[PDB]
Amino acid sequence: PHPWFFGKIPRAKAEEMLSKQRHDGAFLIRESESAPGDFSLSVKFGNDVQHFKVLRDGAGKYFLWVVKFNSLNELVDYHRSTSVSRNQQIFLRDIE
Amino acid sequence: PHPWFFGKIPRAKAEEMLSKQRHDGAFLIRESESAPGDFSLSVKFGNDVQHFKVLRDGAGKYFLWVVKFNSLNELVDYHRSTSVSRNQQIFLRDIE
Numbered sequence: 001p002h003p004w005f006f007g008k009i010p011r012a013k014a015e016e017m018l019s020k021q022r023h024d025g026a027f028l029i030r031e032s033e034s035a036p037g038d039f040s041l042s043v044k045f046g047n048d049v050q051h052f053k054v055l056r057d058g059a060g061k062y063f064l065w066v067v068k069f070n071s072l073n074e075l076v077d078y079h080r081s082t083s084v085s086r087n088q089q090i091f092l093r094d095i096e
Numbered sequence: 097p098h099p100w101f102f103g104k105i106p107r108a109k110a111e112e113m114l115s116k117q118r119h120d121g122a123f124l125i126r127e128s129e130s131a132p133g134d135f136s137l138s139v140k141f142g143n144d145v146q147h148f149k150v151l152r153d154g155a156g157k158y159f160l161w162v163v164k165f166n167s168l169n170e171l172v173d174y175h176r177s178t179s180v181s182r183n184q185q186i187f188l189r190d191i192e
């Protein structure tokens with residue numbers, strides 16, 4: 001079916017299992033104990049095993065985090081080294 | 097105080113100006129004509145000029161475009177190459 005989707009299992013169990021795997025990035029998507037319905041992402045990284053809430057927006061799309069800005073300026077700067085277009089490498093550069 | 101803000105200049109005027117510039121990336125921010133109140137980004141690129149809508153979210157943040165997925169599958173594979181931590185470099189690796 002899916003080697004990474006162990007459905008509903010305890011956060012502890014996961015933490016237990018992952019702490020064994022011998023590689024950073026070892027993960028699995030389980031069903032949250034706390035907030036039902038929502039899935040969580042457990043991953044091993046070093047001497048720990050972190051979790052990430054699998055967020056969903058209005059539209060239903062999935063995502064772990066996205067990049068938004070507090071000011072036009074913060075947006076601009078960011079986009080001097082990260083494309084403004086989603087299908088073309090376009091980086092902002094001063095006029096001039 | 098800001099060399100890239102051109103207040104309320106016609107979209108056409110922007111193009112005109114920007115098209116003269118010599119570097120892919122030249123740009124300016126203006127008050128959308130077609131949207132009294134919103135800001136738009138004009139960036140010179142290739143023989144033409146592209147325009148972007150500076151969007152705002154329910155929290156009133158600024159952004160141009162984000163990365164979200166229609167399926168958990170998509171989200172995972174994507175995160176094999178892209179960190180899942182906005183503060184740490186962690187890439188998904190299958191379990192053993």
Ligand SMILES: C[As](C)(=O)[O-]
Nearest residue numbers: 011032033034040
């Ligand atoms: C948030 As959790 C650990 O219950 O998936």
